[PDB]
Amino acid sequence: DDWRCARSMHEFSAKDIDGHMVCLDKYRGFVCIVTNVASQCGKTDVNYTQLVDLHARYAECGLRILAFPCNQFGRQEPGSNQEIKEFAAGYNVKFDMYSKICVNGDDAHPLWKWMKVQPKGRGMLGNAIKWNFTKFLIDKNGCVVKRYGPMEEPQVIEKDLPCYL
C-alpha cells in the first residue's frame, strides 16, 4: 500500500472493462479526464453525452478519457461490467472504459486513493468522492491538475484544456 508515494498516474495499472490489465503509462503525453461513472444516475445523460462530445472534438488534440464505473453512490451502477459496456455503447463511447471499482474506503482502487490526496485533487468537506461523476484532469506527465465535482458538467472542463494541451 505504497500508492501514496506515487508521483504520477502513469505508475498505476487497472483492469479495463473487458478484464485486460492496462498500465496507465500509455497515457504519457496525453491530457486525461478520469471520472467515476454510473448508469442510473440523474447526471448520467449529460455526463456521457458531453464526455463523448469532448472526446470526439479533442482526441486528435491529445485528450483521453478513463471512465471507472462505481456503485457506491445510491447504488446507481448495479450492473455487470458487460452490461455497463453495452450501456456506454449506446452513447457511442469511444474512450476508455474500465472495470467497476470502489473509489472511497479501504478497498478503493489505488489510483483513486492517490488522486484524492494530490494538491489539486483535494475535496470540499474532505477528500472523499461525494457522488457519481466527479472528474479529475490529469496533465501529460500524469499529475492531477484539477478536480471537478458531480454537478460540473464536462463542458466546463473545455475552457481549461488549453492550459494543458
Swiss-Prot record:
This is Phospholipid hydroperoxide glutathione peroxidase GPX4. It catalyses: a hydroperoxy polyunsaturated fatty acid + 2 glutathione = a hydroxy polyunsaturated fatty acid + glutathione disulfide + H2O; 2 glutathione + H2O2 = glutathione disulfide + 2 H2O; tert-butyl hydroperoxide + 2 glutathione = tert-butanol + glutathione disulfide + H2O; cumene hydroperoxide + 2 glutathione = 2-phenylpropan-2-ol + glutathione disulfide + H2O. Widely expressed with the highest levels in testis, heart, cerebrum, ileum, stomach, liver, jejunum and epididymis. Expressed primarily in testis and sperm midpiece (at protein level). Expressed in brain (at protein level). Expressed in heart, liver and kidney (at protein level). Expressed in retina, especially in inner segments of photoreceptor cells (at protein level). The gene is Gpx4. The active site is at residue 41. The keyword Transit peptide applies. The chain holds residues 33 to 197 of 197 of the full protein. The modification Phosphoserine is found at residue 8. Monomer. Has a tendency to form higher mass oligomers. Interacts with FUNDC1; this interaction promotes GPX4 recruitment into mitochondria through TOM/TIM complex where it is degraded by mitophagy. Essential antioxidant peroxidase that directly reduces phospholipid hydroperoxide even if they are incorporated in membranes and lipoproteins. Can also reduce fatty acid hydroperoxide, cholesterol hydroperoxide and thymine hydroperoxide. Plays a key role in protecting cells from oxidative damage by preventing membrane lipid peroxidation. Required to prevent cells from ferroptosis, a non-apoptotic cell death resulting from an iron-dependent accumulation of lipid reactive oxygen species. Keywords: Cytoplasm, Developmental protein, Lipid metabolism, Mitochondrion, Nucleus, Oxidoreductase, Peroxidase, Phosphoprotein, Selenocysteine, Transit peptide.
